[PDB]
C-alpha cells in the first residue's frame, strides 16, 4: 500500500489570496495523481488528473504540479466557490489510496460569539435526567473554550461539545455545549453559568440563570 500525506489538514485564507496544498507520497508514482474537491455535504468532484491536467469544468486559476513523491495544488485568486475539502489520490496501480484531506476555510474579521444558556425543559426532568444547554454562536476563528459553573464552582464532569462546520452564509463557526446531570443534583443547586473564552476578548462572556426565581 502507498501512503498519501496531505499538508495542511486545515487552512484558512481570504477570498483573493493564493494557496498551495501539498500531497506527499511514500513511494514514487511519477505523475499519476488526482485531486478532488468536496463541497459541504456533497460528494467529491474530480479537479485534476495526471498531476497537471484539469478536468472538464475546472477554472484555469487551478493548477496542479509535481512528480515522483511530492505534488502541489495551487489556487490563484481564491473565489468564494473554491472553499471546501480537497484530497489527492494516486492512480498508479491498485490499491488506490487517498490523502487525509485539507479543509480550506474562509478567513474573515474576528467576531465575538453570541452566547445563550438554556435550563432543562420540564418534560426532560420527568424522565429523571437534566440537561443544561449553552450555544456559542457565530464566532471567528474556531478556537474557543467553554467553562461550566454550578453555584460558582466549575464542573468538567458531564459535559458534551459539538462544533458546526464553517457557515456557508457568514463564514463563522458555532458551538453547542451540554452539561448533563441527574435531576436530583440539578434541583439541589440554584445558579448555572456558561463562560466562553475566545481571542476576541480578555475577559470571558458570561451567561447564567437562577433556578430559584
Amino acid at each position: 500500500d502507498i501512503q498519501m500525506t496531505q499538508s495542511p489538514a486545515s487552512l484558512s485564507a481570504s477570498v483573493g489570496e493564493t494557496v498551495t496544498i501539498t500531497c506527499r507520497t511514500s513511494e514514487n508514482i511519477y505523475s499519476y495523481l488526482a485531486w478532488y474537491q468536496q463541497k459541504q455535504g456533497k460528494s467529491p468532484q474530480l479537479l485534476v488528473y495526471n498531476a497537471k491536467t484539469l478536468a472538464e469544468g475546472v477554472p484555469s486559476r487551478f493548477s496542479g504540479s509535481g512528480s515522483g513523491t511530492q505534488f502541489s495544488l495551487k489556487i490563484n485568486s481564491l473565489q468564494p466557490e473554491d472553499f471546501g475539502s480537497y484530497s489527492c489520490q494516486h492512480k498508479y496501480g491498485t490499491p488506490w489510496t487517498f490523502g487525509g484531506g485539507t479543509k480550506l476555510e474562509i478567513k474573515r474579521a474576528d467576531a465575538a460569539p453570541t452566547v445563550s444558556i438554556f435550563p432543562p425543559s420540564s418534560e426532560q426532568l420527568t424522565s429523571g435526567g437534566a440537561s443544561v444547554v449553552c450555544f456559542l454562536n457565530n464566532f471567528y476563528p474556531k478556537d474557543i473554550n467553554v467553562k461550566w459553573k454550578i453555584d460558582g464552582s466549575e464542573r468538567q464532569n458531564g459535559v458534551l461539545n459539538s462544533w458546526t462546520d464553517q457557515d456557508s452564509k457568514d463564514s463563522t463557526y458555532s458551538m453547542s455545549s451540554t452539561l448533563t446531570l441527574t435531576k436530583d443534583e440539578y434541583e439541589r443547586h440554584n445558579s448555572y453559568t456558561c463562560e466562553a473564552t475566545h481571542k476576541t476578548s480578555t475577559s470571558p462572556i458570561v451567561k447564567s440563570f437562577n433556578r430559584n426565581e
Binding site: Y32, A34, Y36, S43, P44, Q45, L46, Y49, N50, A55, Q89, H90, K91, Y92, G93, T94, W96
Partner: peptide, 16 residues
C-alpha cells in the same frame, strides 16, 4: 474510474 481513453483509476463521476 474509466470510461474511455488511455488513462484510468481516478473517479471522474461520483454518486450521492
Amino acid at each position: 474510474t474509466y470510461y474511455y481513453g488511455s488513462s484510468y483509476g481516478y473517479c471522474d463521476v461520483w454518486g450521492t
